[PDB]
Amino acid sequence: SDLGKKLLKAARAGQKDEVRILMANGADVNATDIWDATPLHLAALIGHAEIVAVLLENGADVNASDITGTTPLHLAATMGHDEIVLILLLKGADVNAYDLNGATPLHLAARMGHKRIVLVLILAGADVNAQDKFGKTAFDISIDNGNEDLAKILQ
């Protein structure tokens, strides 16, 4: 709807107050764009933690996937948003959800060298052995980028 589209725009812009207004007006917390990305997808990508908490409090799907299969945990893992990874994990996100490339948030975090996100995902219950469409594990990605500190953890 008109309100549903404005909720996505407000979450992308990082407008905390506007999100609260649109929610009270009855906007769909899972309103999707052309790519099937919810407002939680954009708040996770932007790295706004207050809005992520608000959307989750109003019934947002923590495991929502878009056309590409990207869940909001993938976006928080890649961009390096440590708090939003933890918040989504406590809300009940699937650590082992994969996208169209078969990459779990452990893969995306390992590619970007986010050591703490990698450790948080393992603590949450990530599958270290799991491989993507190319057949590479999170350990195999660290070896290719020369991150010896990361590789020792994924053993």
Partner: protein
Amino acid sequence: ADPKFESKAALLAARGPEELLCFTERLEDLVCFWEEAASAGVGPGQYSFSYQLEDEPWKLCRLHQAPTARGAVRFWCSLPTADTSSFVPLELRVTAASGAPRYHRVIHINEVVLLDAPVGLVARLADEHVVLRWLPPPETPMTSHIRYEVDVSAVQRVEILEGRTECVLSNLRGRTRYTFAVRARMAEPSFGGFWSAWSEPVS
């Protein structure tokens, strides 16, 4: 204008490898790029760059394949001027021809400014010490809001208040020739970005 973009693209590539990197030079343009390994069947027609700004429908940008000195393949897209509005969020998407994800980001045009290197750096010794003078980067607006930084090699790095285009180095180890270089960045209130490249060094 492309040999400098070549140097600018290699500049950011060292800081954020495995990322999608965007930058603007005159606040009316935008150049996004990323670097990956060469694949047998993959070219610029195997990826799809799409952006969405304000409430205008998702638009497609033309990708260009170009090789780098380090052996990787650089794919870059130059957003048109009409779509570069400085102070609104801009959603970016790079999707593989199979439908699989590659990059997804939200940036602000004003928050990603990479200036040119300063020019005409002149070092002259007055007794105290050396006084350094230079010119602002060419074709760059709002000179009064440009912060600088000077590098000394023997190392020392001194910050220069925005607007000022000259400095005096107080204490030095001796009359030997030091190698100087200056780089520029965008200051405040809403603007920000990356350090430009170093100027042509002088001794």
